[PDB]
Subunit: 99 residues, 2 copies
């Protein structure tokens, strides 16, 4: 689709058998999601950095549907003020900025 | 242009007679810029909210060129880890998300 930016660009994602809402956030490098139990191995990753770091679990090559596009990408899982789709997954769905 | 998201979408902005770099950030409601002295009246605004708020100066109807597009928009001025173009200015330049 083409998403105008008058409102927050919140979209439905399907991940690990759950549907969720997440923000399409081009100011985020990585994708961070709140409350999802994903199968397979993870490694700990530090994110944030302002005030301290936040530790999260990094699962790679994760199947995720963003707005009806089935893609594969690193998802970071742990505490977040909001679910965020970062650039890493926006590239996989072919999402560009246009004007 | 069409901006792919493999790298951070950093663009040149011209504001109050200076050229600057800022991030096109669709996860930011407002536009926040570091070190710029803008003429005219402002009001104090609280932004952030996690850990505390950050006080900044809000100047409205500010002339700004983003990537060669001359637009008018509210700019918030004060301390920021990076210069951020928020949705408020992305709408003015006609910037959408596309996939």
């Amino acid at each position: 689709p083409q998403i105008t930016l008058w409102q927050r660009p919140i979209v439905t994602i399907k991940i690990g058998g759950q549907l969720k809402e997440a923000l399409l956030n081009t100011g985020a490098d990585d994708t961070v999601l709140e409350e999802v139990n994903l199968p397979g191995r993870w490694k700990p990753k530090l994110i944030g950095g302002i005030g301290g770091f936040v530790k999260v679990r990094q699962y790679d090559q994760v199947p995720i549907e963003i707005c009806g596009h089935k893609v594969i990408g690193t998802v970071l899982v742990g505490p977040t003020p909001s679910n965020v789709i970062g650039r890493n997954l926006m590239t996989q769905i072919g999402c560009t900025l246009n004007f």
